[PDB]
Amino acid sequence: STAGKVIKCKAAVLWELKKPFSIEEVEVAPPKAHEVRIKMVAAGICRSDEHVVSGNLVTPLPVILGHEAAGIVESVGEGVTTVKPGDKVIPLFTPQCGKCRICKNPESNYCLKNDLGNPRGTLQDGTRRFTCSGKPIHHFVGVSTFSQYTVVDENAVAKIDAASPLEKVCLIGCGFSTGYGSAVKVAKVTPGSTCAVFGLGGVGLSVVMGCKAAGAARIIAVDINKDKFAKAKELGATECINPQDYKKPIQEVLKEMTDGGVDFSFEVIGQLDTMMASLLCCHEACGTSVIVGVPPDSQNLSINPMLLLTGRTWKGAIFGGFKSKESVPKLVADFMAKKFSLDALITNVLPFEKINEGFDLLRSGKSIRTVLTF
Amino acid sequence: STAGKVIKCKAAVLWELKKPFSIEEVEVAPPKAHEVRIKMVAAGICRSDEHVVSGNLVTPLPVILGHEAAGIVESVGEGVTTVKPGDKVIPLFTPQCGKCRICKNPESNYCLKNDLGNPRGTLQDGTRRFTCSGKPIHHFVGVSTFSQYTVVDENAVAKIDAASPLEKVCLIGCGFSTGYGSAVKVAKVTPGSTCAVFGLGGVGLSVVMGCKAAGAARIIAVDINKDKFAKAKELGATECINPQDYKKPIQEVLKEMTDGGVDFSFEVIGQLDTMMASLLCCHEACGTSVIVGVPPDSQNLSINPMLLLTGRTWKGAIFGGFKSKESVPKLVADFMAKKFSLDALITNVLPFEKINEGFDLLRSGKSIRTVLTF
């Protein structure tokens, strides 16, 4: 029907930095061997997408952004055995080939098939499936979900519960899993511990959720926008602090509130100064600090090695440390079992065609997650 | 006898930086209620003592250095209950007050009573027990072991096996414990993993021993002094490489030898470039890098947060993460049960009077650990 044929649809293309997305008519090639073409149903707006627009996260242009989403399999290529047409799925910006050193290591998830580190803007075979007015369009982190139809590698697509509400579970595609996992899986927050969370957007709030789920005694939420505090409290924050209210640097305020520092700190903003503050705020002898935020391209931190010699542990992670393919289905299963809710994270719902308004909402600081419906 | 009296004894005093130690008579005050005066038997020469001489590690002068040692208790304060005159003990440069947040924490060891962070060069009560030519002399990390007699706080001295050969077990006071601990307790090296060890001095070779004890499949010893290779191999290194032998950076040489990088890397030198090579040489997705070497004073590293974001863990530790007072006696009991050997680490034994000569040996790279006899 459309199987084996090229599909003509709409997609939000970014042709230039700092410019609005352009809803364009695009051609989506049929899926090659071990590939899956997906009809998108819902896509969340994550700060990382915006990082590309602003120039903070470098990627080849023109490109179709979007990586937090959920859809339904339209067709599959030769050899596909994990999903079938009609299956509800969530694309994985961090693939899980299952065969590489990293996929085989129980404690890691940054699969060697990824396109995050040194962006090619292509699928795993090094080619593109998108075209627009005679111009090829680059993919984004292997998924390009801001399109009515996208084609992805089989190891970058997870099959989920058939009764799943895609307009909600799409957050498991990035935001929620990243934040939740950063606390429960990466930092391995312990019951009775003290945590400091920098940044209260969709990812940071999911970190607050993770810390509460891990049984943290104190979860101090840090954010320069006091409007983000109510939600942080509802989700588990015991205290909310605004750096702008203090004469002292935020790390010193945090250390004074916590007997020398927190046991676990998380930077969920993407700024060098806040990464430094987060490291400095965890206790020098027993603190752990996790970098979640994506820093601006080519910018380096200035760190004194003594900060680590006394006993600190500094680490970072992509997608909360979750091995994508095996984890996403389980997270959806937990959601269906009502282990956690994502309603608090969805502040706005807009049709895909109003993607620009969704980004305006993010930039304004009012929204957490705006979900786009196709 | 000497109990309750001032003792005039020989000590090695450092009056100025980059100058030989001055061997002379000093007056050592009796210990206070919770202090212990120790007659030194053996003291090891560690690179950290040299860091003070060179100016790399800042501490107030004039000072009596030394921190890796073993002696016999001459007298104790009336409040002392853990050691008695005649007991063989090892002074702990990292104390274990047992009452602070850190001492209560089963996973940390950087007791808040330490004098490592911002050196006062005194005992815990803020005063000094040393005088020479009338002038007060500063202590070093609360222990100052380069003296025939020293006075230390009770929580900074551990009672060890009475049958212990002090000329060997003094290494448990720093070098060995630090190296072994860094691998087994800090990095928590796992069976079948790959490790890279930067620096093959007494501490680095002990890290090799720890990696071996942990069952590492590969232990790549790195050093620009090829004379250290035979011993690295004897202690467990599977391979030995010299950075100077290659045209490309050592981190790339290591990554090419280990499928993208080692699982665990350790810097046991104290230089910025090697701390960077060490971080860069562990796999970006599953590697853990431990800082053991003491960095040069007032110097920063320039790091791109993405090095951590992909999945690396970067941490540091003091004294191999061992809670000093409870661990030192057990480590000696292990030595006495022949669970590990220290012979290979001791390459030179000189009388205390030849301390300057022992330091020249370290500087020339001709020795691993030189032990001084009193």
Ligand SMILES: NC(=O)c1ccc[n+]([C@@H]2O[C@H](COP(=O)([O-])OP(=O)(O)OC[C@H]3O[C@@H](n4cnc5c(N)ncnc54)[C@H](O)[C@@H]3O)[C@@H](O)[C@H]2O)c1
């Ligand atoms: N590691 C990953 O795999 C991963 C995954 C998803 C997102 N991210 C990154 O996580 C970060 C957060 O994503 P988000 O979608 O939640 O973004 P967001 O913009 O919705 O949230 C950012 C929050 O940070 C707060 N903030 C900004 N500057 C601050 C400062 N100086 N001090 C304290 N708070 C400040 C903002 O007010 C906002 O509440 C971004 O950098 C994103 O790129 C990383």
Ligand SMILES: NC(=O)c1ccc[n+]([C@@H]2O[C@H](COP(=O)([O-])OP(=O)(O)OC[C@H]3O[C@@H](n4cnc5c(N)ncnc54)[C@H](O)[C@@H]3O)[C@@H](O)[C@H]2O)c1
């Ligand atoms: N964390 C701690 O608690 C702790 C404890 C003890 C010692 N230390 C520190 O550990 C480090 C090692 O102590 P040590 O006594 O074993 O010192 P050492 O001088 O005996 O050993 C240093 C080794 O590194 C090698 N080396 C020096 N520069 C190099 C370079 N650029 N590239 C490759 N190899 C190089 C030297 O040849 C030597 O083999 C020192 O910085 C010391 O201050 C720290």
Ligand SMILES: [Zn+2]
């Ligand atoms: Zn893989």
Ligand SMILES: [Zn+2]
């Ligand atoms: Zn995202």
Ligand SMILES: [Zn+2]
């Ligand atoms: Zn030492």
Ligand SMILES: [Zn+2]
């Ligand atoms: Zn203590």
